Design an enzyme around this catalytic site. Structure first.
Site, mmCIF file in Angstrom:
data_model
loop_
_atom_site.group_PDB
_atom_site.id
_atom_site.type_symbol
_atom_site.label_atom_id
_atom_site.label_comp_id
_atom_site.label_asym_id
_atom_site.label_seq_id
_atom_site.Cartn_x
_atom_site.Cartn_y
_atom_site.Cartn_z
ATOM 1 N N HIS A 137 46.714 70.146 31.048
ATOM 2 C CA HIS A 137 46.491 68.987 30.188
ATOM 3 C C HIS A 137 47.152 69.081 28.822
ATOM 4 C CE1 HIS A 137 43.869 67.538 33.178
ATOM 5 N NE2 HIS A 137 42.883 68.380 32.926
ATOM 6 N N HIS A 176 41.940 67.312 38.496
ATOM 7 C CA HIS A 176 42.305 66.443 37.386
ATOM 8 C C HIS A 176 43.816 66.273 37.337
ATOM 9 C CE1 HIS A 176 38.373 68.194 36.097
ATOM 10 N NE2 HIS A 176 38.152 66.987 35.605
#
Ligand code: SHH
Ligand code: K
Ligand code: K
Ligand code: NA
Ligand code: ZN
Length: 644
Positions: A137, A176
């Site tokens: 991320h 994710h």
């Protein structure tokens, strides 16, 4: 040629944690590392890997992916008290800082670079880095989602710069979306990024429109970003394998990467409170195994997320088992992906059809508390592969292969079988091969000393009959047969215990759903055609069938066709079935084919295919097979079904 698997870990990376109340961050704990390493130790796996030390990523290496401003700000956090670390954390989304996290972030990044170097220098075949904090991320100028620096983006940028690589595949199977990786390479055709992720129509964190299937990359990078959003929770083994067979693998084998990097978050596993998916830890054995033939096996697995300490340890073990070459577990209960998954799959395939050969026929109408069972043991066979060349032929075998020695009972069985089904047979060479087949099968089936085998034979029908019939008795509940050749074999598929794949030259209609016949037109496009059949037809059916044994058969006429440029890839991929238990019958001696077969059977790395596109006549033939078979074998489906 490279051997061994690197394991990069250091307990210093467990020495930072959350220091204030934050229900959003409290799942990311030091114990994720502790539990994973200790699970590897408990199962004897860490002891079998080459321990490679961590190091710090240098400032220059950090600046490959991050801005000076962001690095300078993060470089101040070791001097901050708790109140100041809180204020600094609040500038970012879903991330916390700690006096030691900058240090640990440099170690996670350096560990990844250590892994790239070990693999790219051929010191090891492959490996895994167990690191904290995760990275996928984080962005050029922002920490995000427990990530400080983008470990996997570093690895691809560093591999580009220091090894002059032109094609790198990044597979992000974390639950994710790795938006930091997507942004880093969106314009770069040299890096292909694939991510599946819980999305739920953008209501799932990080809630980004550009995590949808329509983000295909930008500019020269169009087509090299692939997002597969999961719009419902509860995705199963079937959904994940449908994603691999019908999206990821066709593109990855066409791309032909020179290195594979895995963003390996196991929050995509059953039991995880973030993912809420239902795939079993055993699926990661297969996700790893299906990618291992790429890039001559050069695979760097990097830990991202995973928050259920139990499924985390088991999924880490299943991955390292496969990196070490241990036999894959059998996956039962496979079928169609669910409707939501088939919708995501058909949508990504349609938008990607502008860029990828495997999907191009789609572009025009002419062409078209949770608990689960503990995983079983995965023990490598003492002798992985046994080989029975023609009498006299001595060969140099890999260290884990052996020649067959017909026993007394075995010889009595051949006489018995001779004295029932082939009475007028005395050709004592055939009778030797039947003793070889029975001897090899009994070692494969009864003992765990031997995994698979290859026998050279002269007469196909008698050898095939005795191989198959001997496998059915002394239970092998189901047998997958893969035959390269023409004609009909003594193989009856009218009882559900045998599925027959035949790759032939004559176009012959088949009538029932336990047989897949592939007539591929002759020519240069034949290699691309077979690979498309293998990933999109053979593997989905074989996986759903779930055989207990695989029987490979190559007739002599076919042993020198372009179709055997791929024999190594099939043999490696097909060992995802039947825990690797495959018996191959080669009709006639071909030195190379026997060398290639033994090599792939033994788990050796195999050469890449390099470069193209398959004949549209072949694509039509394969999609007609899919239409004919996907009602029975739902794992073949890559569109939502028609409601009546
Ligand atoms: O695993 C990760 C990082 C996880 C991102 C953080 C989740 C976002 C969130 O809102 N979590 C949450 C908040 C409150 C209660 C429970 C979960 N990336 O691979
Ligand atoms: K992902
Ligand atoms: K790219
Ligand atoms: Na916050
Ligand atoms: Zn995650």
């Amino acid at each position: 040629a490279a051997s061994g698997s690197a394991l990069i870990f250091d307990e210093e990376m467990s020495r930072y944690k959350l220091l204030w109340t934050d229900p959003e961050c409290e799942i990311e704990v030091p114990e994720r590392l502790t539990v994973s390493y200790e699970a590897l130790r408990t199962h004897g796996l860490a002891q079998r890997c080459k321990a490679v030390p961590v190091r710090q990523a240098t400032e220059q290496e950090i600046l490959l992916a991050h801005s000076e401003e962001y690095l300078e700000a993060v470089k101040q956090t070791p001097g901050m008290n708790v109140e100041e670390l809180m204020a600094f954390s609040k500038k970012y989304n879903a991330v916390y800082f700690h006096q030691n996290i900058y240090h640990c972030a440099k170690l996670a990044a350096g560990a990844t670079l250590q892994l790239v170097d070990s693999v790219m220098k051929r010191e090891v075949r492959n490996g895994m880095a167990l690191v904290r904090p995760p990275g996928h991320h984080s962005q050029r100028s922002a920490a995000n989602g427990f990530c400080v620096f983008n470990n996997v983006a570093f690895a691809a940028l560093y591999a580009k710069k220091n090894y002059n690589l032109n094609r790198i595949l990044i597979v992000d199977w974390d639950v994710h979306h790795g938006q930091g990786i997507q942004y880093c390479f969106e314009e770069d055709p040299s890096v292909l990024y694939f991510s599946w992720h819980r999305y739920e129509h953008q209501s799932f964190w990080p809630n980004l429109p550009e995590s949808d299937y329509s983000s295909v990359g930008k500019g020269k990078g169009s087509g090299f970003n692939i997002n597969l959003p999961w719009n419902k929770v509860g995705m199963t083994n079937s959904d994940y394998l449908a994603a691999f067979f019908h999206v990821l693998l066709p593109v990855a084998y066409e791309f032909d990467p020179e290195l594979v990097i895995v963003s390996a978050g196991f929050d995509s596993a059953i039991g995880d409170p973030e993912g809420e998916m239902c795939a079993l830890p055993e699926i990661f054995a297969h996700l790893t195994h299906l990618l291992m033939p790429l890039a001559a096996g050069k695979m760097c697995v990097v830990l991202e997320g995973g928050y259920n300490l139990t499924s985390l340890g088991q999924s880490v073990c299943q991955t390292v088992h496969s990196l070490l070459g241990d036999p894959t577990p059998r996956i039962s209960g496979l079928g169609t992906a669910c409707d939501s998954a088939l919708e995501s799959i058909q949508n990504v395939r349609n938008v990607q059809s502008s860029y990828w050969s495997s999907f191009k026929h789609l572009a025009q109408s002419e062409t078209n508390d949770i608990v689960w069972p503990e995983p079983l043991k995965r023990m490598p066979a003492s002798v992985r592969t046994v080989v029975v060349p023609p009498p006299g032929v001595e060969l140099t075998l890999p260290k884990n292969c052996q020649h067959s020695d017909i026993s007394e009972s075995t010889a009595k069985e051949v006489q018995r079988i001779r004295d029932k089904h082939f009475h007028d047979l005395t050709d004592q060479n055939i009778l030797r091969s039947l003793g070889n087949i029975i001897s090899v099968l009994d070692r494969m089936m009864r003992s765990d000393e031997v995994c698979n085998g290859c026998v050279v034979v002269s007469d196909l029908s008698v050898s095939v009959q005795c191989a198959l019939q001997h496998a059915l008795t002394e239970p092998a509940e189901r047998v997958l047969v893969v035959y390269v050749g023409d004609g009909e074999l003594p193989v009856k598929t009218n009882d559900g215990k045998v599925f027959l794949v035949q790759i032939c030259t004559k176009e012959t209609e088949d009538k029932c759903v336990n047989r897949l016949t592939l007539c591929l037109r002759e020519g240069e496009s034949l290699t691309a055609g077979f690979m498309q059949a293998l990933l999109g037809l053979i593997l989905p059916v074989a996986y759903e069938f779930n055989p207990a044994l695989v029987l490979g058969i190559v007739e002599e006429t076919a042993a020198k066709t372009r179709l055997m440029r791929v024999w190594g890839h099939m043999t490696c991929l097909i060992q995802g079935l039947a825990r690797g238990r495959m018996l191959t019958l080669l009709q006639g001696y071909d030195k190379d084919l026997l060398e290639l077969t033994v090599s792939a059977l033994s788990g050796a790395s195999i050469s890449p295919l390099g470069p193209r596109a398959p004949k549209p006549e072949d694509v039509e033939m394969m999609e007609k097979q899919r239409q004919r078979l996907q009602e029975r074998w739902g794992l073949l489906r890559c569109t939502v079904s028609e409601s009546w």
